[PDB]
Amino acid sequence: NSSITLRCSVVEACGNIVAELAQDPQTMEHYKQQIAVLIELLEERFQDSNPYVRTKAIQGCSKICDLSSKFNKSKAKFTSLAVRSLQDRSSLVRRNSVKLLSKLLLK
Amino acid sequence: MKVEELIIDGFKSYATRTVITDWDPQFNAITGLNGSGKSNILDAICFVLGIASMSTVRASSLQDLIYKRGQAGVTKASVTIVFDNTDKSNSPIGFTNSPQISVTRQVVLGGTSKYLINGHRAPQQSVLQLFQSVQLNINNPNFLIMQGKITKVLNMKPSEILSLIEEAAGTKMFEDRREKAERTMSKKETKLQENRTLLTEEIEPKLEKLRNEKRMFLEFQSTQTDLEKTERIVVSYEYYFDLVRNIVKQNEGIDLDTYRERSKQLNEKFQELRKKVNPNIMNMIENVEKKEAALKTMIKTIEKDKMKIQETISKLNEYKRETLVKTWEKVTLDFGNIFADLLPNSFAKLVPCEGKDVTQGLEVKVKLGNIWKESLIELSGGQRSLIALSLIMALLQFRPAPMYILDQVDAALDLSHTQNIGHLIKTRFKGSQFIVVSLKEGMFANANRVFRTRFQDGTSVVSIM
DNA sequence: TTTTTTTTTTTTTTTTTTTTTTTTTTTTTTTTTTT
DNA sequence: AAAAAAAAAAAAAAAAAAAAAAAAAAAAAAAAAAA
Ligand SMILES: [Mg+2]
């Protein structure tokens, strides 16, 4: 959909919906591919045209990287996407990528 | 609003914080050598009062006003002016309870300017409305004669000579707002016309389709009651624990096969009307009926609003025209008398153009002796300077603006008329603060305050001589 | 010798495009107050 | 002690006014020819 606000809405929805399913004994076996397709979707949304969707993607990835009982494979891909997107056009996506790199370096 | 302090930071020839104090409320006079920074003081005053067309401040941009274009360490250009308010009659609206009014305009590199009053920030419309209330409008001035533009006031088109009298009357701030109001009403009118044709083409067709499926929904609800009576009777009669006996003994002996095919023929209409009409169409048609009624009430109120605004501006134009004529008669009388006192055996009048009306434009006509000059192009630079000065002082005699800025109005006058202008500003035309830049000593030797300007070490300084 | 015609030059007026500044909308960041 | 609301700032796109440049029309002046 061409509206920016709905794209940022559903991107923040995927970020908050992965970031809350981190308490262990009902997450990694009940829904395993529905959470992986959302992780991959948040990875693909680093390339949206308007930079607010990219900012919401990086913020969702940075709130994913706090609680880590699983998906430690994905943190290296988040690091690669952050160091790729460290030189975008908008200052907002760059600043939030610095925040994401600091977040994954502290933990 | 007598100016009391002028603080210039990072402007054109001013690299440091220069604070000019000791302004006399009657007659201030700025002097100095060539290339010292006098017209840059007047450009700082014009810049703190607000400019759109940067050719009257002599720049092609806004970063061209900072010191050495901002590429010499002073990256900001801020101008501060302080006004005294011991006289509350010329005070603006709302600021009566403040004995000092400070206005500052700042511009940094890259971006644009920002204004602050008394330390607190403000947009440009607030300071423009503050300065358009004591008729200190820089965008269309009746008080500012920049350098080399004193022999060119008589070269003005009749709309500008009309606009000076309009600013003296007080109706230029109504005229530009009325033109902006007509333009904004035209743009919102074509937007509302697009909205009306979208309402006519896109809403009421779907509204009558919704009314069609509403009456089909009443038919479908009649079949709904038909199902929940007849099929309940049917499933009760094939179920046959005492309630089913009680609802059997009212309809004893109903035929089975006809009731079964009647149930089937009811359910086929049900599977048709299930995909025909949604079951919640009544609340939907109530919602869109309320929205359409409120929409049409809004459009009627908008149309009556436009009618009221248009009839009010058409009623205000008559009082504008009457106060324009009443201003124009007194201003042309004082114009003739001041020009007769400056240049002897002379006269000048402001006349409406040939065949048209006073509110279409005005023209200056000059008499030297007993002969009328058919065209004022044959006059000297000194006579045209005297006609322009006498017009500005006639506008002072109608309603005195607080600050009259004069950038070298004596460059074409001789040594008698320069001393006479200095004497007539010191003696006759009291009631305004005059900021005059001159190099002839006969003008600033009849002064109450004199500021020298000098160029030293790359910057400019102002010394109270 | 005067008037008329033609050609050339100059000035004024009007029109068009671009640039700069300002305005508008949405989002983000920072500060203060209340539960 | 933390959260919510309001204000200010930033970015992108669009609009308005002024300045500069270009084109067309009109008027004036000079020269030549004819009666
Ligand atoms: Mg000067």
Parallel/antiparallel/unpaired status of strands B449-456 and B459-464:
antiparallel
Q: Known binder of ligand: residue B37?
A: yes
Å from the A90 CA to the C26 C1'? 15
Closest nucleotide to B53's CA, by C1' atom?
D18
Q: Is B7 left (phi over 0), alpha (psi -120 to 50) or beta?
A: beta
Q: Known binder of ligand: residue B35?
A: yes
Distance in Å, CA B405 to ligand 1 centroid: 12
Distance in Å, CA B12 to ligand 1 centroid: 13
The per-residue b/e assignment along B440-465, b for 16 or more CB within 10 angstroms, e otherwise, is bebbbebbebbbbbeeeeeebbbeee
Å from the A16 CA to the C35 C1'? 26
- If 0-12 CB within 10 Å is exposed, 13-18 middle and 19+ buried, where does residue B241 land? exposed
Q: Known binder of ligand: residue B370?
A: no
Closest nucleotide to B107's CA, by C1' atom?
C21
Parallel/antiparallel/unpaired status of strands B433-437 and B403-407:
parallel
Distance in Å, CA B381 to ligand 1 centroid: 18
**Residue among A19, A3, A11, A95 at smallest CA distance from A46:** A11
Contact A26, A72 (CB under 8 A): no
Parallel/antiparallel/unpaired status of strands B113-117 and B120-122:
antiparallel
B456 pairs with which residues across the strands?
Answer: B459
Distance in Å, CA B43 to ligand 1 centroid: 10
Greatest extent of chain B over all pairs of C-alpha atoms, in Å:
132
Closest nucleotide to A92's CA, by C1' atom?
C28
Å from the B158 CA to the D30 C1'? 36
Output the 3-class SS for chain B. CEEEEEEEECCCCCCCEEEECCCCCCEEEEEECCCCCHHHHHHHHHHHHCCCCCCCCCCCCCCCCCHHHHCCCCCEEEEEEEEECCCCCCCCCCCCCCCEEEEEEEEECCCCEEEEECCEEECHHHHHHHHCCCCCCCCCCCCEECCCCCCCCCCCCHHHHHHHHHHHHCCHHHHHHHHHHHHHHHHHHHHHHHHHHHHHHHCHHHHHHHHHHHHHHHHHHHHHHHHHHHHHHHHHHHHCCCHHHHCCCCCCCCCHHHHHHHHHHHHHHHHHHHHHCCCCHHHHHHHHHHHHHHHHHHHHHHHHHHHHHHHHHHHHHHHHHHHHHHHHHHHHHHHHHHHHHHCCCEEEEEEECCCCCHHHCEEEEEEECCCECCCHHHCCHHHHHHHHHHHHHHHHHHCCCCEEEEECCCCCCCHHHHHHHHHHHHCCCCCCEEEEECCCHHHHCCCCEEEEEEEECCEEEEEEC
Distance in Å, CA B36 to ligand 1 centroid: 9
Contact B138, B126 (CB under 8 A): no
Å from the A87 CA to the C27 C1'? 21
Å from the B227 CA to the C25 C1'? 55
Taking the C-alpha atoms of residue B394 and residue B165, their distance in angstroms, rounded to an integer, is 10
B49 pairs with which residues across the strands?
Answer: none
Taking the C-alpha atoms of residue A70 and residue A24, their distance in angstroms, rounded to an integer, is 8
Method: cryo-EM
Closest nucleotide to A90's CA, by C1' atom?
D11
B106 pairs with which residues across the strands?
Answer: B78, B114
Phi, psi (5° rounding) for residue B204?
-65, -30
Residue A68 DSSP one-character state:
-
Å from the B52 CA to the C17 C1'? 19
Å from the A79 CA to the C5 C1'? 90
Distance in Å, CA B35 to ligand 1 centroid: 8
Number of neighbouring beta carbons within 10 Å of residue B306: 14
Taking the C-alpha atoms of residue A9 and residue A51, their distance in angstroms, rounded to an integer, is 14
Q: Known binder of ligand: residue B38?
A: yes
Å from the B372 CA to the C2 C1'? 34
Distance in Å, CA B16 to ligand 1 centroid: 20
Chain D: bases < 7 Å from a protein Cβ:
8-12, 16-20
Q: Known binder of ligand: residue B39?
A: yes
Å from the B390 CA to the D35 C1'? 58
Closest nucleotide to B180's CA, by C1' atom?
D16
Distance in Å, CA A89 to ligand 1 centroid: 46
Closest nucleotide to A52's CA, by C1' atom?
C27
Taking the C-alpha atoms of residue B240 and residue A33, their distance in angstroms, rounded to an integer, is 52
Nearest residue (CA) to C1' of C27: A52
Q: Known binder of ligand: residue B236?
A: no
Closest nucleotide to B187's CA, by C1' atom?
D15
Number of neighbouring beta carbons within 10 Å of residue B46: 20
Distance in Å, CA B56 to ligand 1 centroid: 12
Å from the B303 CA to the D25 C1'? 46
Parallel/antiparallel/unpaired status of strands B433-437 and B449-456:
unpaired
Distance in Å, CA B388 to ligand 1 centroid: 19
Helix axes B158-169, B172-202, angle to 10 degrees: 100
Taking the C-alpha atoms of residue A102 and residue B300, their distance in angstroms, rounded to an integer, is 58
Closest nucleotide to B157's CA, by C1' atom?
C13
